Amino acid sequence: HQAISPRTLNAWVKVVEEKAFSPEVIPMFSALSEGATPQDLNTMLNTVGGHQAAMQMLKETINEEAAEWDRLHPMREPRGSDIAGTTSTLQEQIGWMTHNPPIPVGEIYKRWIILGLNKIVRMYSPTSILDIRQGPKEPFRDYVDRFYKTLRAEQASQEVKNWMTETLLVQNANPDCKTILKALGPGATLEEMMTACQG
Amino acid sequence: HQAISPRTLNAWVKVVEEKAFSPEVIPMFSALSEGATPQDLNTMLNTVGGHQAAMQMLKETINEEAAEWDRLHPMREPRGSDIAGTTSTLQEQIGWMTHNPPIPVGEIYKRWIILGLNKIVRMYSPTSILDIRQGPKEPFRDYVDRFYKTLRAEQASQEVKNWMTETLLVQNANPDCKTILKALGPGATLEEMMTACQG
Amino acid sequence: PIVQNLQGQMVHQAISPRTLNAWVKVVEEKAFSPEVIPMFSALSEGATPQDLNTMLNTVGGHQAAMQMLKETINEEAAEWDRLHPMREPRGSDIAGTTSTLQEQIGWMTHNPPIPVGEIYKRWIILGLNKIVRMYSPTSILDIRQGPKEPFRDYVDRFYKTLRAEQASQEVKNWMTETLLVQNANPDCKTILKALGPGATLEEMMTACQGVG
Amino acid sequence: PIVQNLQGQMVHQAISPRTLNAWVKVVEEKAFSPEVIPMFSALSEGATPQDLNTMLNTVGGHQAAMQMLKETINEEAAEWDRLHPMREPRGSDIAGTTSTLQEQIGWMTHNPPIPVGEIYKRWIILGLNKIVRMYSPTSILDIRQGPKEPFRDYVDRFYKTLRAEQASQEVKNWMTETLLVQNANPDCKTILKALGPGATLEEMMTACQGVG
Amino acid sequence: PIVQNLQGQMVHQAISPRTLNAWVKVVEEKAFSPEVIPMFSALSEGATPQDLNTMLNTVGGHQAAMQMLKETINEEAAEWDRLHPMREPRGSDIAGTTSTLQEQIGWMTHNPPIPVGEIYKRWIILGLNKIVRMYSPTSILDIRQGPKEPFRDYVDRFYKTLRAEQASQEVKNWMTETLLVQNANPDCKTILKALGPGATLEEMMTACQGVG
């Protein structure tokens, strides 16, 4: 066991401040927090500047997951608060991690944090994808890039997302690209759509 | 034992000069000062640039905590001044930390510095949590961000902060959103609250 | 009332003068508000029919109220005689006009007890409920929250008028559920309807705190 | 209550009619202010569960308050039965609905005593605290000193609202320390902040005498 | 209190519920005016330390007042222990927190009597005097006769504020002699100074009848 290096905290702060809570911060958090105890995760989340409403969402989600863990699971065994790093201590956490088999309180807490971060990203989505419409001059590549960005941020289910990509993307296109998309018709990959909709 | 590298001091200087004394400075100080002697802590505190009023406040708080330690407590026994590093050597500080059992003079000094930094953070936070109020035209997201930043800088007990989160957020909202928040009622989560108050 | 002798023989204990004075103050000063029935029940605890008649003698100053109290007592006595044809206490004898004190003490001390005092008390309370219903300054449909009135004061007025109204229990439940919301001012009524149906009085009160 | 016989055998002493009338006056006139709980404690000193039920029968006029008083009593009885599985007094029997008088007298006279009356009194006081919390006209955050209001009157209003609020003890301490100063008018608030943190209520009152 | 048995053995007589209710009404309604100390003395006549503690339990609703009442009681108990080093009643045992009832009855019934109840009553009255001093709306120097105020009303306000002030006796004498005249309005003040020094309150009142 080694204490969290400063450079990881600097990287976490930098990515959070530069990317906001965009969908790409989840993998960055997951990679930075590799092998991190609940104390380290708490320090990482405390270093975040701004976005304190989002941090409140995250800790509310952690509370919900801790309550669910306590409901499902009625040395000392770890409870939801212990896994969250509130009532437990560093020695207990690292002991649980080093037990054979390991009791990875860090990984479970990281899963809870990832769920809360996904909720944060969905809430921080600037606009609903129903309002993402191609302008009368915007290129199809730019419009569709924005569309799939909003779709990734919205985190809709796969079955719904298939319908959205199939129909809504075509329906929201501007009249010229709209006509070319009808001419292409269904069953066409996005490769065909964008290579045919050029200019 | 190893003397602190210049990278740690450069990181401390960078975070202080960039973020000022925001609540996120506390975890950064805690992470940077891991396993640090009082001499290392004094060097880290000396490397700071401006905010000399804040540094004087930290000195005063450390003096108060040293007086309290001397009152509590009637190789050589470490006193408050010895903990502060004014009347102690690096060798004596390596002592009491390599001692069997150890009395971690470094951790106590870090705790006093953390108390002083909490006081400085509250001083640098301009407005009181009771005074944080939603503007008539302000978005609820911005208002909640300001509210939770101020609350994190508020420096009160945890139960008190829980009560503040429960009550003051609804109490201080503008009349346009306060009626919606009352209709939601107690028990509504923050995600529900800021989805409802999106308009 | 009735108390035990040193030898255990139950004997009369007349209602004290200041208890009667308290009853007189209730009758004269309260103007037959709903609270006179709780106060009549309190001041006449374990009272014999003779004690109840002594209490009614002070109500006797009010001619109309006394006359309909007497008429309701007579109706209830007739109903008791119809349904219930020392000796068995006759319905007229429950009122104490005919019976003597020792018969009443014997009936209340019987094994099992014959609570004649409680029965006459219930008849008197029925008559007082009628009188209270008459003297209500306004009907429940007329209670309305003002623009400035706090929801607590309006709720108190509404529930006092509901006590005076004395409708059926299901009707009262509907009234508290719907008419309470209907008569609130628009500022409170918005939150009242936002809470939706089924809200208890506690939620309704807490949500409307300081809205006025 | 319970009193000694001439031979030392403990016997019932029913709550007097005027004590019940005082309780009825408290319930009807005070509109469930915080002071009803001290007054309920005073008027029901050394009272058996039967006496407490007699007192609650007068509260019964208020439908909502009685219903949640009953629900809180039931919850506390269930908790007592869970934690505590003549005979041992069952939690439902502490309420007196099932038990008879002699069992209650025996339990309160036991060596060591089984204060069933005090337990039922505590449950009733919990329910009355809930009712008092509901009926508060304003929240503690809404109490504000006016430009003319003396600091004494404002402090009295603040502390009465604090009693109605019934937050945690640490929360109450923070409230009295900080929110009391925050809500004072600027003329007093200047002196309040000049005194600095840690000032007791005595210093705060003396320094702000006649400032308005 | 304490009463004689039929056989002459002194036994406890608990403070009645309505006396406690009267004390609660005094505490809640009067807002700690000077009159609470006479009323506390009246309602606690011949009271044991247990009875005094029962009375203080109702004051306990007011957090600050209870806390400084307790602190003054502790200070007086410490002073008693310092000056006074069954057994001899310890100063902490005068408060009744440690002692039991029979010890208190024995001490109050001793030959010569050990008035422990009166001593604890004096300590409580000292604490209540402190609380009364705090809650005074204005200082004695701020009491002033208005242009229309009769001299009788102004004198009553002045003397009530003097009771709340609780300065030294010589200081109080000087205040009544000089400050009472100084604060009167010019119409009355002319006659007040014309009477000259040494005028008793009777002459001062009679001469200023109807002057306003």
Side-chain angles (χ1 to χ4, degrees), chain D residues 2-5 7-8 10-12 102 105-106 108-111, chain E residues 5 7 11:
Chain D
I2 68 195
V3 317
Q4 284 215 46
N5 274 309
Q7 56 262 33
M10 305 301 247
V11 75
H12 190 61
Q102 194 65 18
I105 274 169
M108 309 222 324
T109 57
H110 197 267
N111 279 314
Chain E
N5 274 309
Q7 56 262 33
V11 75

Side-chain angles (χ1 to χ4, degrees), chain E residues 84-123:
Chain E
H84 288 67
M86 77 205 170
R87 54 133 164 74
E88 212 68 0
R90 298 294 300 154
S92 100
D93 256 326
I94 293 189
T97 188
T98 37
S99 160
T100 181
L101 210 160
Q102 194 65 18
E103 307 178 318
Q104 292 157 24
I105 274 169
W107 284 315
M108 309 222 324
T109 57
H110 197 267
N111 279 314
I114 293 155
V116 65
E118 191 65 55
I119 293 152
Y120 188 26
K121 198 164 128 180
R122 192 166 33 262
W123 300 346

Side-chain angles (χ1 to χ4, degrees), chain A residues 54-125:
Chain A
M55 302 346 281
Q56 185 66 26
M57 311 205 198
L58 182 53
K59 89 199 217 90
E60 272 183 354
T61 297
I62 288 154
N63 279 323
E64 287 174 4
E65 295 292 327
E68 173 261 25
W69 178 273
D70 226 24
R71 164 181 331 151
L72 265 62
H73 304 67
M75 72 202 309
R76 210 169 59 74
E77 288 287 358
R79 311 306 196 197
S81 202
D82 296 326
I83 279 149
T86 298
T87 42
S88 59
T89 191
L90 171 63
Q91 181 53 59
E92 287 180 286
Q93 290 153 18
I94 206 81
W96 289 326
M97 262 159 251
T98 51
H99 190 293
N100 188 11
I103 331 303
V105 301
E107 296 280 12
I108 301 146
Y109 185 31
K110 206 212 294 190
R111 286 206 319 278
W112 300 351
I113 290 154
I114 289 279
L115 275 151
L117 284 165
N118 281 310
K119 290 200 186 180
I120 289 156
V121 171
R122 170 156 41 77
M123 273 291 289
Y124 258 75
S125 280

Side-chain angles (χ1 to χ4, degrees), chain E residues 1-5 7-8 10-162:
Chain E
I2 68 195
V3 317
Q4 284 215 46
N5 274 309
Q7 56 262 33
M10 305 301 247
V11 75
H12 190 61
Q13 173 59 294
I15 189 168
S16 70
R18 266 152 70 201
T19 307
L20 277 161
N21 183 35
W23 172 232
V24 175
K25 275 144 67 170
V26 166
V27 168
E28 298 293 322
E29 302 187 354
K30 230 71 75 168
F32 288 111
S33 312
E35 61 239 51
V36 306
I37 288 140
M39 288 174 184
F40 173 77
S41 301
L43 288 158
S44 80
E45 276 287 358
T48 70
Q50 188 170 340
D51 293 299
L52 292 167
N53 294 328
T54 312
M55 291 180 74
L56 262 47
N57 288 350
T58 72
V59 170
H62 304 76
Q63 289 290 352
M66 189 69 243
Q67 102 191 345
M68 51 179 107
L69 191 55
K70 265 292 300 193
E71 99 193 354
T72 311
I73 289 155
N74 287 348
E75 287 174 41
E76 291 292 331
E79 211 286 337
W80 178 267
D81 278 2
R82 188 174 69 74
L83 261 286
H84 288 67
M86 77 205 170
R87 54 133 164 74
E88 212 68 0
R90 298 294 300 154
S92 100
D93 256 326
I94 293 189
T97 188
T98 37
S99 160
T100 181
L101 210 160
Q102 194 65 18
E103 307 178 318
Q104 292 157 24
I105 274 169
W107 284 315
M108 309 222 324
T109 57
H110 197 267
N111 279 314
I114 293 155
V116 65
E118 191 65 55
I119 293 152
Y120 188 26
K121 198 164 128 180
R122 192 166 33 262
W123 300 346
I124 291 157
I125 287 154
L126 210 71
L128 293 165
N129 273 291
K130 217 191 297 307
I131 293 154
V132 160
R133 209 208 329 294
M134 163 176 40
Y135 274 87
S136 325
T138 52
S139 62
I140 191 72
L141 296 157
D142 283 314
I143 273 60
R144 304 221 171 61
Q145 192 173 358
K148 176 56 184 234
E149 173 157 22
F151 191 69
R152 156 165 171 287
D153 293 328
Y154 158 75
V155 166
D156 260 311
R157 293 194 304 98
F158 189 91
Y159 266 86
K160 199 124 180 288
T161 302
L162 210 80

